[PDB]
Amino acid sequence: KEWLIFALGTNNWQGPGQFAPGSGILHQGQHIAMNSLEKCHCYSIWPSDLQKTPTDRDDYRVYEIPHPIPICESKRWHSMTDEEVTSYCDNLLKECTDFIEYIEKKHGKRINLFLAHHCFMNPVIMSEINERRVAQGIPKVPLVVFAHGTALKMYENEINKLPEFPMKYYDWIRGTKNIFESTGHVSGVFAVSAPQKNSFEKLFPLFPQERVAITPCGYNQLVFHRIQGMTREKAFGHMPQALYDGFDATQLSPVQRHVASDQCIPDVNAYDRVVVFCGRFAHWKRIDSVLKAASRWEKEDKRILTLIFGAGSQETRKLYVDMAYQTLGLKDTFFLGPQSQPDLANVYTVADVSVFPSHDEPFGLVFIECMGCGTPVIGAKSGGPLDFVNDEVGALVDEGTNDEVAERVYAAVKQALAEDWKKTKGAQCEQYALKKFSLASQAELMLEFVESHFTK
Ligand SMILES: O=c1ccn([C@@H]2O[C@H](COP(=O)(O)OP(=O)(O)O)[C@@H](O)[C@H]2O)c(=O)[nH]1
Numbered sequence: 001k002e003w004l005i006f007a008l009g010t011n012n013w014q015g016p017g018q019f020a021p022g023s024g025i026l027h028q029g030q031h032i033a034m035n036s037l038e039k040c041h042c043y044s045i046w047p048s049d050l051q052k053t054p055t056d057r058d059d060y061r062v063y064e065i066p067h068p069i070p071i072c073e074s075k076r077w078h079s080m081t082d083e084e085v086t087s088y089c090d091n092l093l094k095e096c097t098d099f100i101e102y103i104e105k106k107h108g109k110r111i112n113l114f115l116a117h118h119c120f121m122n123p124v125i126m127s128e129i130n131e132r133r134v135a136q137g138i139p140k141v142p143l144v145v146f147a148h149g150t151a152l153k154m155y156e157n158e159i160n161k162l163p164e165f166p167m168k169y170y171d172w173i174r175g176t177k178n179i180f181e182s183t184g185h186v187s188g189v190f191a192v193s194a195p196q197k198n199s200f201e202k203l204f205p206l207f208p209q210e211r212v213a214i215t216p217c218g219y220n221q222l223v224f225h226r227i228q229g230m231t232r233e234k235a236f237g238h239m240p241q242a243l244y245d246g247f248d249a250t251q252l253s254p255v256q257r258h259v260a261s262d263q264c265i266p267d268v269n270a271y272d273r274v275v276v277f278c279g280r281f282a283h284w285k286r287i288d289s290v291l292k293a294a295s296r297w298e299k300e301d302k303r304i305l306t307l308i309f310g311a312g313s314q315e316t317r318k319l320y321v322d323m324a325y326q327t328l329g330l331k332d333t334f335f336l337g338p339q340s341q342p343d344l345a346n347v348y349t350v351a352d353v354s355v356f357p358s359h360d361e362p363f364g365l366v367f368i369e370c371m372g373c374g375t376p377v378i379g380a381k382s383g384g385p386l387d388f389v390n391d392e393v394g395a396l397v398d399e400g401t402n403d404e405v406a407e408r409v410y411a412a413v414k415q416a417l418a419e420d421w422k423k424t425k426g427a428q429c430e431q432y433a434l435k436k437f438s439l440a441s442q443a444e445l446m447l448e449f450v451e452s453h454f455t456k
């Protein structure tokens, strides 16, 4: 099977004078990945108001625009005129169709796969290009979509008759254009997580659930890698605490003076070792099992910093913050809420071990993301981690009651710090993540899925 992929990105790649979105830095990693595969050429196109298509290579082109790239939530997509939008999309359409003829003439062969990067406009374009490719007697080429999210929260506010999100597009991609109302336009769709798999499935239900999948699991080794010369302070010293709106800093005992909203941690270099959690504040992450376990080790007078990354509903955020400080006496355990992935790579890079004691973690990307920067991982014998965590990169605790897990986590962090798993396993954690869950393997799994699940 020989692949001639044309991929339509939604954001700008990393470059001179431009950092990348998330969906952009990915398109880029994927572009390299797919091209590195035997029997595979992928051509990408993707917009910027800074960067210019290259002169010394043809694998990609830039869609040069004067304004910043639109957004779904600086330029908003509803904020621009109707005439602004139509053009922005019909200009892009012409660039893509030129590019495609360039490619198809180049290779003496028809493109046999279209990627399109959010659920908005990029699919409509490729879907329109495809109708016309049939107008001339040349097969339409199967089109797969990446549902990262941003364009669906747009569709949800339109439906939720939210403020700045009047109803313009949702009933258009649906009633007027008919993109996800059958397999006649979009052959398949990849979500990153079952949250997104459902967010989409409710929105476009005449789209077969059999044709909405989860991307084969990888991590983005461009982002997640051993970050050179990172410090404690460089990586998270200037990260302000989170907690919750209404956090009464005044009930904190004295020893807990260190805790306070929108206030960085004092004296990062003062703590002997660092221990990291990262994940949505779901109940099954068993955040509570960590704090329980950190409560037992802060009293051991070894200076163990404990960081609690991730985002949570103001109810559940208040739950664990108050469980941590009021209920357990946690003075060396700060909540810094959610963080970008690159900031997180800096954090992992300087962390001694990470603990993600999820019950039935479906796959757990934070496990391999953290390994991809050279630090070991501790988790539980349930779910996705049973298949790739081993004694060489960390540990999985025997499953049990939350209090049971927490005692076992405590046992784990204590051994990991004491045997310096960072030094003794950090090397293999890195070479292991990069080998088995690089964008290169995820690309290979993905094209392979697409062949047998989306070629009707
Ligand atoms: O503060 C955070 C926490 C998580 N993530 C990302 O969220 C994704 C999902 O991991 P999580 O544990 O939140 O949930 P999952 O879908 O793995 O159950 C991973 O790509 C993480 O790097 C992130 O970008 N920032």
Ligand SMILES: [Ca+2]
Residues within 6 Å of the ligand: 117, 118, 119, 120, 146, 147, 148, 149, 150, 151, 152
């Ligand atoms: Ca989307």
